[PDB]
Amino acid sequence: NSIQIGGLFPRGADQEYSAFRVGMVQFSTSEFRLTPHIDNLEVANSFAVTNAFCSQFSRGVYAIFGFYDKKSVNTITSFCGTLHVSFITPSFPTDGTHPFVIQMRPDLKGALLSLIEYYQWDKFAYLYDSDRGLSTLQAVLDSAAEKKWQVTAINVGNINNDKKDETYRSLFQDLELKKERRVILDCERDKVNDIVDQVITIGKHVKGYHYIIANLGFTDGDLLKIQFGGANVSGFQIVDYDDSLVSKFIERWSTLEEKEYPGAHTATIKYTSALTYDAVQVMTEAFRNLRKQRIEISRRGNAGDCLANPAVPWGQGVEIERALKQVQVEGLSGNIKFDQNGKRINYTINIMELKTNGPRKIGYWSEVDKMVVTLT
Amino acid sequence: NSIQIGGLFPRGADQEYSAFRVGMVQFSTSEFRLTPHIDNLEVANSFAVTNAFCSQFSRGVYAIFGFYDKKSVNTITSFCGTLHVSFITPSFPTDGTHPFVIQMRPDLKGALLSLIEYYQWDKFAYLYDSDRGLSTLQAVLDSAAEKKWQVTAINVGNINNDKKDETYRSLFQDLELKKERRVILDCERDKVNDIVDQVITIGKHVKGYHYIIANLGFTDGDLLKIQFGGANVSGFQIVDYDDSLVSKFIERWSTLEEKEYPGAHTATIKYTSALTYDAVQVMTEAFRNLRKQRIEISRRGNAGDCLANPAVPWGQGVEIERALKQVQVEGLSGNIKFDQNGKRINYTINIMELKTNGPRKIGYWSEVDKMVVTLT
Amino acid sequence: NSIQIGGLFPRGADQEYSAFRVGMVQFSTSEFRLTPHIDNLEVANSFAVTNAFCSQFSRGVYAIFGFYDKKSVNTITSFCGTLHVSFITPSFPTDGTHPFVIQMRPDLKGALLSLIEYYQWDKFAYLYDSDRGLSTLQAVLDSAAEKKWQVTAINVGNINNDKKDETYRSLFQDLELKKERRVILDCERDKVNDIVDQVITIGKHVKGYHYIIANLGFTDGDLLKIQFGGANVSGFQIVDYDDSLVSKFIERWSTLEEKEYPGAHTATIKYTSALTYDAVQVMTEAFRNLRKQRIEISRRGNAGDCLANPAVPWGQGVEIERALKQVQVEGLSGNIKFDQNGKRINYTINIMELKTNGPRKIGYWSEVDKMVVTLT
Amino acid sequence: NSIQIGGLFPRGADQEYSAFRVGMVQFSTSEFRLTPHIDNLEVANSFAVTNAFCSQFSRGVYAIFGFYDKKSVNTITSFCGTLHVSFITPSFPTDGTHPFVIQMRPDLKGALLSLIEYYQWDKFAYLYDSDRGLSTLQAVLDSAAEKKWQVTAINVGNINNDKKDETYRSLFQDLELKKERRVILDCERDKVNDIVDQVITIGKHVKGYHYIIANLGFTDGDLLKIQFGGANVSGFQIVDYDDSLVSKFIERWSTLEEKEYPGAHTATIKYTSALTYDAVQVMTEAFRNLRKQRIEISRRGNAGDCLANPAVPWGQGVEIERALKQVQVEGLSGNIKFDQNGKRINYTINIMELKTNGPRKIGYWSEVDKMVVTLT
Ligand SMILES: *[C@@H]1O[C@H](CO)[C@@H](O[C@@H]2O[C@H](CO)[C@@H](O[C@@H]3O[C@H](CO)[C@@H](O)[C@H](O)[C@@H]3O)[C@H](O)[C@H]2NC(C)=O)[C@H](O)[C@H]1NC(C)=O
Ligand SMILES: *[C@@H]1O[C@H](CO)[C@@H](O[C@@H]2O[C@H](CO)[C@@H](O[C@@H]3O[C@H](CO)[C@@H](O)[C@H](O)[C@@H]3O)[C@H](O)[C@H]2NC(C)=O)[C@H](O)[C@H]1NC(C)=O
Ligand SMILES: *[C@@H]1O[C@H](CO)[C@@H](O[C@@H]2O[C@H](CO)[C@@H](O[C@@H]3O[C@H](CO)[C@@H](O)[C@H](O)[C@@H]3O)[C@H](O)[C@H]2NC(C)=O)[C@H](O)[C@H]1NC(C)=O
Ligand SMILES: *[C@@H]1O[C@H](CO)[C@@H](O[C@@H]2O[C@H](CO)[C@@H](O[C@@H]3O[C@H](CO)[C@@H](O)[C@H](O)[C@@H]3O)[C@H](O)[C@H]2NC(C)=O)[C@H](O)[C@H]1NC(C)=O
Ligand SMILES: *[C@@H]1O[C@H](CO)[C@@H](O[C@@H]2O[C@H](CO)[C@@H](O)[C@H](O)[C@H]2NC(C)=O)[C@H](O)[C@H]1NC(C)=O
Ligand SMILES: *[C@@H]1O[C@H](CO)[C@@H](O[C@@H]2O[C@H](CO)[C@@H](O)[C@H](O)[C@H]2NC(C)=O)[C@H](O)[C@H]1NC(C)=O
Ligand SMILES: *[C@@H]1O[C@H](CO)[C@@H](O[C@@H]2O[C@H](CO)[C@@H](O)[C@H](O)[C@H]2NC(C)=O)[C@H](O)[C@H]1NC(C)=O
Ligand SMILES: *[C@@H]1O[C@H](CO)[C@@H](O[C@@H]2O[C@H](CO)[C@@H](O)[C@H](O)[C@H]2NC(C)=O)[C@H](O)[C@H]1NC(C)=O
Neighbours of A (≥3 Cβ pairs closer than 8 A)? Predict the structure, then answer.
């Protein structure tokens, strides 16, 4: 027995594809071995996204895995919820109840606001980028209205790379006029690193300036260049490198070569690749549970084409969705439990601060609890 | 000769389709005869949008007219820019330079900020809706950062109809705590009408309050219920009902029947329908200019399909885009000139206020000029 | 046996006729069977009223039910007192002791003045209408002479529908000059509804204002549009919807159909219909008491005609009047006891106010007692 | 040739019937002599009013003359406007556009308010009686609202004759508390005389107390008993005893006996009888004009009965109405001109003050002009 699936990896996700392969070979069980068909493309081009989607749909697959941006999430959700096709993705969640989508990246607004109100903040800033959405921004604004805050929102995505230095320096210069020393950074690795570069240039890495990285790869970025500025730097983490299974995976990972497994001969791993690993795990577990449910869902014939008018769903797809949304395991990120829509639940988000002795966890967060303090 | 085009209209665009037909029958001529191919659908469904686009592309069209939304704009832009197929639309303009897309709805952030600084505001509120994007909100915030303002942003898009009453009344009830007497409404006609209903129900249309309808359909809404409250009100109107050709069109319009041309036996008209009329005008003018420039665009063969790998555009698409962007005429909205990106320029936006007698034009805004007031 | 009566209902008394039929079918019994003879007409036309009266008198009726107005009350009273034919009516009671007329609508001047002195008013306004007379106005004035008040009386009866808007808005506009924030509305349901519409349109339902609905149909009007304005409101309600038999009647009432019993598939009921129900009740009780007292009333011969000169009454008319005035039962309006003149006594009028949650009974007024407040 | 008409005179209108006969014999022209059928009755009993009306309608008459009170005006207006029958009356006018009615008593609100504002009044009283209506009261109240006055309205009609002295004395006693010396009296001869008696009893006839009699018989009442109190007494007049025709009529009138012409051996005459005279005159003139219009309107057959269902008008009645409403002569009251409704126009109202030398005219009033001052 075998299975046909699809992989939508953007040009440049070498580490993510490496982790995908590592998981496919680790969880490989002769009882049922999967057979994917990768398709790399510009993920921000809905045209190519739909091309690959229809290719993998006609290929006769049951589930699809891949990323998406704020320019293709709508396309993906529509196509999936129409053709009743499960789509797994670590990319940012969706601002709605989009079915047939398995969002592995947990939420962040909760822990972010918890940390904020824990540091007792009332006037700060928020530098955002539209590369992921504006749900965090909307949550921040509503919490400010309900908390009597004074936010200073700014966008740093439309700013090209040719005038970045001049612009950023201008923003940091005209920011001190309001005596604003505390700051937030809702951007990806590239943007946060460019911003830290501009910061070290202006020399604002001195103490009194607090910084929050509103992502999960607090350890993936270049940090040692500002760890000595005495600044109040913080950040979140989703992977805990000090656990049994994650440490074993890291041992098996760093010892790999950068030729047959690019972006894999390191001690740290991107949370995106960790979630790709966990996604391989959960897909294997769901298909195994189906195999153990005394059910065969082999497509009767060719699945068809996207443009089939009218639509042409198949209930066994709903069964696959229900199976995927009924999993509970422990992966690199931790307890992986889902809800009826697809979002994650009952997860852990380790908080981290940058101290002279390196990053140090100072507690965790969850949905049932508020922020916790562990480091005495 | 004859020409074939496409049409994408939502479920409920009766007035817009009527205006489209009116323009088709008015601007027609023996020179060329358009051959539309209408296709109604849920414009917020990317799958249906792709289906309609591919149908009208296989039909062998030379251009397309239609609307879009926050959940289909990226799909439309990608498909057009890839297939080199133009696409006219009055919907909210894109946040970038997307080729092969003719935007008819001019920008609003400039005039809005000019009006705000004219009224000399420093602490107000902003009610937005996830219907046309948050470009206006982002601009308001990134300009408040430099204008020393205190904004209070709120969303009203995720509100259901059963709880709309209790929710709206809670908003303004909370705003009393902050002493918020000045407000901005960046919402659609129905949403602003519901907001105004709740406002008058609560008793806030009385003097001491100010409101701003952040849209071009100022008169498009029902203001008679808030005209005699004594509260400041302001807005924008892209069509000046006191002009020659617009008055002639209104004469030909109100006289018509609500049977063959629904939403037509009235003196008011929605800016969406006005822009539809102007769109038909500019398309006819462009095709006439092309046929007059001793040119040939007729497709030698068929179009194939969207998913033809690799993508295969056709040459005359660039010429058609250059034509549609090389137009300078006048219509309901006023002068109609586009830039390389396709957005409008050298346009005017008449500012208005709600007096006890009726809404009068206090001034107008431009791109090369600021908010020119009219003291009279 | 059977009994024949008459019925005079205006053009539009659907709810009242429905309540009449409901009472006829409810209070019926094998003891006696009523035999109504309905006759609709313009109640404000004395000629038509005389025609109907003479028709139903020649028909050989033993009593009559029906309404009247300021232009027919004298006709009805004279005809009845001359022919010794009783006449039940919920319409406004007469300004005197007119025999053979059973008034069901209890007085209001006492409770109104008690409420006024309870709120401690000294300078207010009074809007009246030439629809039920000016007894309330005359009493208000002759009591202000002794209470040291400053009244501002205004009429709204001679206002047409085309100019109602501009006229109503002019009234309250002029009242601002006198700083008139307290008001009384002695008008019908439709008139008070129009007044309230114009009030909310102008922005005077906000705090700092007080209103009093000088009628028993407090809930009969639409208050949801003025409930959340923040302005004081008060009124009277003769039917307490929170009682056993009234609740049972409402259960039997709302369940009914709007086809056979129009204006019946609702939980609210107009005091006119309630008094119609109570009128049927008391008439049945009186005829049963008569048949039980070993009496005979059946007319030996016909009735002749109204204009029989000289007038020739019949003896049992005085007995029927004594019976109808010798009744003491309970119904929707409450206890039902009459005096020698025929007006009601030992009744109750529940005072009410408009709270944000709903209209609650703050107290009640009586004849032998004053305005008993309920602090709870 | 002859004519049949009707006369509705209340029991006690001996002087009015005498004047009626005097006019019928004076204007008696052999060209056409009228033949009335008098019918005395209690004018405040609509039953008897309708009885007499139907009697004179079946008798085969063309026009009707008589009085009415505030308890029969509606009956009269309805019957007339229904059967299209002209009704002449000196009684108080109607508060509406009641057709087929000839109101000979001019208006009074105009001249009353003119005199008031001429004496420069701002705080006074108003003692009214419902024996005529409340139009004067409503006019006074609206003029007060539009003039910033402080009126003190009081009713003295409901007060029986057994407690009149005690009540009146109480009102005069508790009136001085507001320092109210100026007073108005809107009552008939009996009530005004009783009030003057109570006044002379209390001794309030001293100067400083002003009094206005809001009727036209300022000279018909008992005045010499208070003419010496030095009070500021005023009053209106409609008849000027110092003119040619009126003086000749008085000469022919006083010389008559009180046996064949009761209430006629005097030097003064009631304005009601003067208007009866003028009504005889105008009816004769209208019938003469019809005779001179080459038209015969003899009823084809028996006119029928009131209760004829449906109604049974006749256009020649409309012709009679148009003829009566197209007269212009000079009678005891002066220029008698009518309007489309029936009211009078272009008349004179001589004002009068009570001085030690007796009543003295001090000007006049009209509809085209305001109050005038003649007595230097
Ligand atoms: C950077 O991080 C350090 C912790 O490593 C922060 O230290 C402490 O900051 C808190 C927050 O302000 C202080 O608490 C407060 O004291 C102020 C004094 O007026 C009071 O108003 C607050 O309500 C609160 O109680 C705390 O005393 C302070 N202690 C030490 C040893 O630093 C530091 O504030 C952070 N700086 C920035 C710019 O975020
Ligand atoms: C509604 O609109 C009216 C007029 O458009 C506003 O009246 C305006 O109120 C502002 C502030 O109260 C006035 O500005 C101030 O004027 C004084 C001089 O009186 C000056 O000393 C201050 O420095 C400031 O400039 C403005 O003059 C006044 N406009 C007019 C025509 O009188 C009103 O405030 C608006 N209401 C709301 C709730 O927005
Ligand atoms: C609407 O109703 C409320 C309450 O029913 C009214 O509040 C009432 O206002 C009056 C006058 O402002 C208060 O009377 C005064 O109270 C003070 C003590 O605060 C006393 O010294 C005065 O001699 C006088 O009695 C009354 O207490 C107050 N009621 C409550 C419960 O606070 C309000 O005025 C009404 N508004 C209108 C427009 O009628
Ligand atoms: C009774 O009638 C006599 C006329 O025969 C009135 O005489 C005059 O009354 C007028 C009205 O008040 C006086 O005019 C005023 O003088 C006051 C003084 O403060 C002024 O405030 C007014 O604006 C007006 O100009 C007039 O002087 C006075 N003259 C005489 C010789 O009496 C009398 O007032 C009447 N009394 C009453 C109680 O109606
Ligand atoms: C939520 O997730 C936690 C993850 O720890 C669940 O709890 C424990 O589950 C892990 C496996 O994920 C076991 O190894 C542990 O023995 C469990 N107990 C403890 C104390 O760690 C937990 O059951 C999940 N559910 C809820 C409702 O919290
Ligand atoms: C911008 O638009 C204006 C119209 O608002 C245009 O100028 C008018 O164009 C006509 C020709 O169609 C000229 O005759 C007028 O003189 C122009 N207006 C003025 C004030 O001169 C034109 O398209 C643009 N004009 C400018 C100055 O940019
Ligand atoms: C006035 O009306 C009341 C009802 O509001 C009546 O009294 C109730 O009548 C019942 C008999 O039907 C008695 O059992 C109750 O005791 C009465 N009420 C009270 C408080 O005692 C009755 O018709 C009149 N009562 C009075 C006191 O006038
Ligand atoms: C209004 O009535 C007057 C009454 O005097 C009319 O005028 C005079 O009419 C009388 C007859 O009624 C004549 O004897 C006079 O010769 C007329 N003139 C004068 C100066 O008295 C008058 O015509 C009527 N019409 C209007 C519009 O006022």
Answer: B
Rounded to whole angstroms, the Cα distance separating A18 from B330 reads 58
Most B CBs within 10 Å, among C181, C198, C205, C209, to test the B interface = C205
Resolution in Å, one decimal, please.
Answer: 3.1
Peptide bond into C93 cis (omega under 30): no
Token pair in block for residue B211: 């409101």
CA A263 to chain centre: 18
Q: Residue D37 and residue C77: Cα distance in Å, rounded? A: 28
Contact between B20 and B65 (Cβ < 8 Å): yes
Sequence-distant (≥ 6) Cβ neighbours of residue B90 within 8 angstroms = B67, B104, B105, B271, B272, B275, B276, B279
Q: How far apart are CA D346 and CA A93, in angstroms?
A: 88
Which CA distances in Å does A299 have to A62, A280, A288, B200, C94? 8, 22, 18, 59, 87
3-state secondary structure of D235: strand
Task: Give dist(CA D310, CA A287) in Å, integer.
Answer: 89
3-state secondary structure of C127: strand
The torsion region of residue B175 among left (phi > 0), alpha (psi -120 to 50) and beta comes to alpha
Give me the residue from C50, C130, C142 closest to D50, CB to CB: C50
Q: With the CA atoms of D363, D369, D370 and D374 taken in that order, what torsion angle do they form, in degrees rounded to the nearest 10?
A: -20
The fold for domain C1-106+242-346 equals Rossmann fold (3.40.50)
Q: A107-241+347-376: same fold as A1-106+242-346?
A: yes
Token pair recorded at residue A61: 């697959």
Compute the distance between CA of residue D237 and CA of residue D115 in angstroms, rounded to an integer: 13
Which sequence spans correspond to the domains of chain D? 1-106+242-346, 107-241+347-376
Residues A365 and A371 sit within 8 Å (Cβ to Cβ): yes
B54 and B303 Cβ atoms separated by less than 8 Å: no
CA distance C110 to chain D (A): 17
The architecture in CATH of the region C107-241+347-376 reads 3-Layer(aba) Sandwich (3.40)
Tell me the C-alpha to C-alpha distance, in Å, between residue C85 and each of C95, C102, C276, D104.
Answer: 19, 11, 19, 37
3-state secondary structure of D300: coil
Sheet containing B153-155: give its strands across: B153-155, B126-128, B185-186
